[PDB]
Amino acid sequence: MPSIENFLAYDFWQYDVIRHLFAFSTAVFLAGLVYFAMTARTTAPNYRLSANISAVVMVSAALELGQLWLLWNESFQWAELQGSFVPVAGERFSNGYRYMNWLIDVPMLATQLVVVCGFVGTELRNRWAKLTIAGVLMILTGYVGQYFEPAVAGVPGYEGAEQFWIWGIISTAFFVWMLLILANAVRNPQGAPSDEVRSRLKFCFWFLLATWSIYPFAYAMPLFAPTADGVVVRQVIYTVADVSSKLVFGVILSQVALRRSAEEGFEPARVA
Amino acid sequence: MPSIENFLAYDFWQYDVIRHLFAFSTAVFLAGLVYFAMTARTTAPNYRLSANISAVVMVSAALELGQLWLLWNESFQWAELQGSFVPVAGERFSNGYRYMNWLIDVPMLATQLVVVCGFVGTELRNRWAKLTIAGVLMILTGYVGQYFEPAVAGVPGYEGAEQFWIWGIISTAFFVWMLLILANAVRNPQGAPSDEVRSRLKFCFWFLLATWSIYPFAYAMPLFAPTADGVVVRQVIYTVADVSSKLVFGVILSQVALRRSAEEGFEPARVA
Amino acid sequence: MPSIENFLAYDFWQYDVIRHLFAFSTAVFLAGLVYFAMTARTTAPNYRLSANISAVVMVSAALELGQLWLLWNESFQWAELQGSFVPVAGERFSNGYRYMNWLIDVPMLATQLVVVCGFVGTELRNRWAKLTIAGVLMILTGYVGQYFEPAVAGVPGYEGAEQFWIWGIISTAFFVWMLLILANAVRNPQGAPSDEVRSRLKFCFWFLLATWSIYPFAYAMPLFAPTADGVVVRQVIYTVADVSSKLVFGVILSQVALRRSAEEGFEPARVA
Amino acid sequence: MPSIENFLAYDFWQYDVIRHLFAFSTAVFLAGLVYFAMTARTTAPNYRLSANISAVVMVSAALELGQLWLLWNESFQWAELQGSFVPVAGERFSNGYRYMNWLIDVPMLATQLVVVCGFVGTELRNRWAKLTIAGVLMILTGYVGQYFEPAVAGVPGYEGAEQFWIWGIISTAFFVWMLLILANAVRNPQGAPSDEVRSRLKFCFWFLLATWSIYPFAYAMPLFAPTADGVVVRQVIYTVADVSSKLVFGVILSQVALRRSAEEGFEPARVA
Amino acid sequence: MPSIENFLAYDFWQYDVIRHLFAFSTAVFLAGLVYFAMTARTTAPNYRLSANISAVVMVSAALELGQLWLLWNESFQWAELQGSFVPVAGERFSNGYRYMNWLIDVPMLATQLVVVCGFVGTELRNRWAKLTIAGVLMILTGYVGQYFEPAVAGVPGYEGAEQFWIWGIISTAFFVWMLLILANAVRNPQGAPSDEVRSRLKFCFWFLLATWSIYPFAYAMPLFAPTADGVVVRQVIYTVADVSSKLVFGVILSQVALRRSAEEGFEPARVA
Ligand SMILES: CCCCCCCCCCCCO[C@@H]1O[C@H](CO)[C@@H](O[C@H]2O[C@H](CO)[C@@H](O)[C@H](O)[C@H]2O)[C@H](O)[C@H]1O
Ligand SMILES: CCCCCCCCCCCCO[C@@H]1O[C@H](CO)[C@@H](O[C@H]2O[C@H](CO)[C@@H](O)[C@H](O)[C@H]2O)[C@H](O)[C@H]1O
Ligand SMILES: CCCCCCCCCCCCO[C@@H]1O[C@H](CO)[C@@H](O[C@H]2O[C@H](CO)[C@@H](O)[C@H](O)[C@H]2O)[C@H](O)[C@H]1O
Ligand SMILES: CCCCCCCCCCCCO[C@@H]1O[C@H](CO)[C@@H](O[C@H]2O[C@H](CO)[C@@H](O)[C@H](O)[C@H]2O)[C@H](O)[C@H]1O
Ligand SMILES: CCCCCCCCCCCCO[C@@H]1O[C@H](CO)[C@@H](O[C@H]2O[C@H](CO)[C@@H](O)[C@H](O)[C@H]2O)[C@H](O)[C@H]1O
Ligand SMILES: CCCCCCCCCCCCO[C@@H]1O[C@H](CO)[C@@H](O[C@H]2O[C@H](CO)[C@@H](O)[C@H](O)[C@H]2O)[C@H](O)[C@H]1O
Ligand SMILES: CCCCCCCCCCCCO[C@@H]1O[C@H](CO)[C@@H](O[C@H]2O[C@H](CO)[C@@H](O)[C@H](O)[C@H]2O)[C@H](O)[C@H]1O
Ligand SMILES: CCCCCCCCCCCCO[C@@H]1O[C@H](CO)[C@@H](O[C@H]2O[C@H](CO)[C@@H](O)[C@H](O)[C@H]2O)[C@H](O)[C@H]1O
Ligand SMILES: CCCCCCCCCCCCO[C@@H]1O[C@H](CO)[C@@H](O[C@H]2O[C@H](CO)[C@@H](O)[C@H](O)[C@H]2O)[C@H](O)[C@H]1O
Ligand SMILES: CCCCCCCCCCCCO[C@@H]1O[C@H](CO)[C@@H](O[C@H]2O[C@H](CO)[C@@H](O)[C@H](O)[C@H]2O)[C@H](O)[C@H]1O
């Protein structure tokens, strides 16, 4: 069914904040890309896969948010008599453009944590495979569920509110599985890390867990606040979650990657 | 004739999944490009042609999928009375935008496997020429056939269903020829590879064969399911096939290229 | 509410100057990006974070000004009978696209000054955190206020002029706080700088303060000149402020970064 | 006058092939650019100008074909009652967008052959000047002529068919002059080349001559086949000519540049 | 007032040449950018600022000409009954998009000549400041004047022809001042140049002066030929001037920069 945004009108500032958020996010991820590209070689070659993944995630997210920015602009138009942005006739907005890009982001972000924990070879591949299965199944079960949000929001003539619950709860199980995989990686880092590196790996885990926990809440917003203020809050928290979970996590992880690099004698990592 | 997509209406989610898939694929290939560009020099110079080809394939595929994303958006519009995305008046969608880019992708993907098998010089050129002839003829005979899919789908007022069969079967013969060329290359690698390298080359062949086999099935979909659910399934399997055959194959091949590099003493390949 | 630009008609040259300014600015920041990207490695690794931030700021600002350029073009159309550019029906212009990108620019520009002052590690992080809090709160309180500018401009049927004052004055307090943080950094540079470096750091502070002071004036323009000549002047001073505060500041800071680099023996910085 | 394409209607596949060709070509040249950019340093510095020119030509051609792709899309629209793509009211297509970019391509492609032949300094400049004069005059006399193709095609109400002949024949004279300049360069290579290098230079000349000879035929198509099948054939042969004359020529020339590099002791050229 | 182009109708070829010119120019500057970016490190670090400026100028000019290309396309549409491209209702074309980008180009092009003359440090800064003041005042006084060209062209209902004269003559004075600054730089090169380098610096000055002299003539065209043939000639001479003054000047200057580099022992400059 169409996202709940399609069933609301917006005050100038409601619509305006959302297009600002989509545009900001695109810029953050494009800037993030320039940054990670310019800083990748400072990491020792045994950790540089993580640096490289950050650049990959930035490209994905930049395009994710650019598409949303475009479609938001296309889907609503000003109506002076109503003094509102209102849906246009032949376009419908979808928040599901973000979900499909997560098939890149989620497994990649979890993999770069496993890379900095020191797993290599089959042990890296094994974890990457488990994380990609768990991550893909979490994202595809939530994508199905978010197709039922006019129904859960009680918009008249839409049924299948229970599908929203069922698919979200299944998605939550695969989320717990991913977190257990990552928790086992950071609790068992490889390559005899320092206690400072150990602490920082544990911090990266909880940062991931906290920022990733926002997404399930954004998913449930149609159920709490199916209103234009709800829609604004939802996109606000997606913006915080996106920037945190991808760019800020990339910087924090890069800092741990550099410490490990430097503790293992990489000179570029030590002179910086 | 126009593709079978032009003769159907879509439910919100049907159209929405397809635009998500096209957008996702574009992002994957653009991210793939950043990645291959950032990782090419880690391969020894005798294998770096393969690394370079991966970047070339990513550019091609990114543009292939971007065009489809654009045309999909342009070709259908929401109709609230029908609650469907429906064709617009002056635009018609074509799946044939993908075929023409395959003239780059297919021969390039098969060439980079021959490069990692160790063929150089005329033996590389000879194989590249055979593969490019076989690949170009496979793609152009299938492009002709896919112009007859309203006819094979039984859409009234379209004739030449037999052309779809004839041209697809000819295309299948050139496909078998390409596979025989590649099978002979991976069975006879050059440069005295390890048994591990030998196995991994053989795996790359079967990965290619499996992923490339999906395309003939996507071609035949108008015959099995000329419906909007069929159209969704078709674009789903194209997405799996594209990402597998190009990006995932590029990563697997890069890993064999690095092993060979390292077994031949390239230090960047050994320190990574 | 919509920005004051939406409530005015423009003479050819009024509208034309503004689209020229938006386009110029985009070009400056894109050129700035090529430049900072091509010059970053000339800085010693202990100062290269500053070089990198400049590139990040250029990307942000390029997109900031590109969005404005687009929306300006979209929001008004020529009307030969009136001989004016006049608002279009379904689009409304917003100056608030610039505010959201400042959440990147402002803290980043203040951070790169602290980097060149020599703060590292927690002392860098501590300052970055204070600056990001102070900067985010300054920008978000001013974003709220600029949603009330038809009201402060006295456009009939818009209320809440007092909100414009309240939110602007709160924003000014966080501005003073940022300046105090930076003033303490430049007065206490680290790493035993030369007196030439000391002076140049102090100059960078006052350059920042002067150029950043323009923004509060652009904010208050609806109150002084809610007219199309006022709108032109406002965008003129934003252009001066943007180019100064971001690109010219980046060059001046790079010059101090190079002096410090060279005084610490970095050869690339000495041979240049 | 408008190009002959404007005076025809297209069957789905006629229009569809042409938009596929324009899009393919854009992708080829963008991929070509990534490739030449990633491979330029493998050439010895005395031949790297040729490598660099290839990248320049790829940018030119990518934009040449992108513009055509855009204008083709804009100029015709589907008409279900006619079952044809037909001209739109306010747009007219032009094949002359390709001509103007040739002012870059033609002299640059001929110059990079002279660079690999070994001419340097004034002897390079002298040849570059003659080639640029001969090339500019060939392209501008053919551009004038192609403005008379509805007239030569016999579209009623268009006169000046003789202008098409006159300007094409003048253009052919400057073409012969260019070929004589290049033939004198490849017959008198500099720097004591191998007999293998000598042969390969001669091959590059004939490859250039053959591929460049296609263009005069595409020019004369309005005279032979002023029909929609003629228009398809013309764009097909332009595609072959463009890819051959620019990308394939770039690869072949790069291979000669590398041989010369390696025969002169450049290690990157020898290890590859 | 709107530029004189807005008051004319065009024959197919008149409009078609201008869109070809705008598109060509964009491609030249984008190719120029790839080229200067790929060749900058061949210059000794004491001259590399000039190399870097060339890349900056290419970005500026590419965007300058792209905007014009866009607006030209948007501002006029085909009218089959008139057989002309004619103005559209809600868009008006402006040649003033080029002026604002000159605020980047002009001072940057003059600065890179002063860099290759050997001025460094404050002597460079002093000249850069004088050139930027003189250049900004020349461009802004000419921008004002070009807002009066329907008046000087005698289009009925437009007054202020004298403003066109006054502002153009003031602009010419600042032009003479810039040329005197540069003439003093090339006559007093620094760093004990060769007599060959001295001659080549003098040549670069006269090349600059000749190519820059075209712009005042393009400015005065509305006064000589306020017709569609005049508009074509004007854009033709702008194209020659742009390509000469920016790209060709960049290549000639790079050649002097390399000679100086090599005469001072930079090995990359000597091996090339
Ligand atoms: C929108 C894209 C944003 C990316 C830019 C991020 C800037 C981050 C500023 C945060 C300042 C506080 O935290 C600071 O982070 C930077 C960047 O990781 C760290 O910097 C570290 O890595 C960078 C390269 O990755 C090195 O140039 C630097 O010498 C090194 O110390 C500092 O050790 C830390 O004190
Ligand atoms: C608008 C977009 C702007 C993007 C800007 C991005 C800037 C990102 C800067 C990241 C700086 C944060 O850097 C991170 O801070 C946390 C703060 O607890 C530190 O964490 C510190 O405290 C935690 C507390 O439990 C400890 O477990 C950890 O060992 C310790 O180091 C990380 O070691 C450091 O890497
Ligand atoms: C969409 C863009 C593509 C992104 C690609 C990212 C791939 C990461 C997926 C992890 C898969 C697990 O398998 C892992 O693959 C990576 C990437 O080839 C390999 O990594 C290998 O190559 C990379 C770069 O070429 C080196 O930095 C690394 O040191 C080396 O070991 C690991 O040896 C392997 O264990
Ligand atoms: C959706 C966004 C994009 C995500 C992109 C992620 C790319 C990740 C790449 C994964 C790499 C997998 O790595 C690949 O795994 C297979 C698993 O059988 C290995 O294959 C393994 O089994 C086969 C037989 O089954 C053996 O012949 C082979 O020797 C052995 O290694 C490959 O030798 C290895 O290179
Ligand atoms: C729109 C993007 C604009 C970016 C281009 C900026 C060009 C600036 C020209 C200003 C000329 C006067 O000031 C001049 O600045 C340049 C650039 O910082 C300085 O140049 C210094 O840094 C650059 C690299 O960062 C080195 O190549 C140079 O050798 C070194 O001296 C000069 O020491 C100074 O005299
Ligand atoms: C719109 C296009 C923009 C194109 C690019 C713009 C290029 C910008 C070039 C910036 C040149 C910087 O030039 C800057 O001048 C100031 C002048 O006070 C110098 O500052 C000088 O005076 C101040 C104040 O008395 C002293 O405290 C300082 O010690 C001294 O160096 C800076 O050391 C120098 O870096
Ligand atoms: C869409 C643009 C894509 C261009 C990609 C080109 C790939 C062409 C491969 C086809 C095989 C032809 O034959 C082969 O050509 C390649 C590419 O020049 C040559 O490759 C040679 O140059 C490249 C770099 O320029 C080196 O990485 C390689 O080690 C070297 O041998 C081989 O010596 C030759 O045997
Ligand atoms: C649609 C995408 C297109 C991608 C294209 C990919 C690039 C293709 C690269 C092609 C490489 C061909 O490589 C080229 O082949 C010809 C074949 O005669 C060789 O030419 C050979 O025969 C000729 C005579 O016929 C001799 O004069 C020459 O000495 C000999 O080598 C060239 O010496 C070689 O460099
Ligand atoms: C449109 C984009 C820009 C295209 C640039 C192409 C420029 C080349 C055109 C041919 C000009 C003929 O004149 C020739 O110029 C080239 C390039 O400056 C000079 O070449 C010089 O610089 C280049 C590039 O830094 C070096 O690789 C070369 O080894 C060196 O000698 C020759 O010494 C000169 O004889
Ligand atoms: C549409 C695409 C455009 C691509 C453009 C490519 C540009 C190619 C570069 C042009 C090369 C010109 O190269 C330039 O030629 C002039 C010709 O007088 C030479 O100038 C020569 O004659 C003058 C005559 O007064 C002397 O003062 C000078 O000392 C001498 O060298 C320059 O020293 C040389 O650097």
Side-chain angles (χ1 to χ4, degrees), chain C residues 12-13 16-17 19-21 23-24 27-28 30-31 34-35 38-39 69 73 77-78 80 85 271-272, chain E residues 1-2 40 45 52 55-56 59 63 67 71 89-94 96-97 100-101 103-104 143 147:
Chain C
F12 180 78
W13 68 267
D16 203 41
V17 170
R19 62 183 172 182
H20 294 166
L21 287 170
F24 164 71
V28 164
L30 271 182
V34 169
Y35 178 80
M38 279 173 80
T39 56
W69 174 75
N73 288 128
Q77 74 197 146
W78 183 248
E80 188 62 74
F85 286 90
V271 304
Chain E
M1 311 152 196
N52 289 346
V56 157
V59 173
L63 284 178
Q67 291 274 1
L71 183 64
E91 190 50 291
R92 281 293 171 282
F93 179 75
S94 189
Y97 260 126
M100 200 71 99
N101 281 51
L103 296 166
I104 305 161
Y143 188 56
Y147 278 115

Side-chain angles (χ1 to χ4, degrees), chain A residues 42-58:
Chain A
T42 309
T43 295
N46 64 325
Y47 297 114
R48 197 171 292 160
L49 173 56
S50 184
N52 290 346
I53 284 167
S54 280
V56 158
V57 170
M58 291 299 105

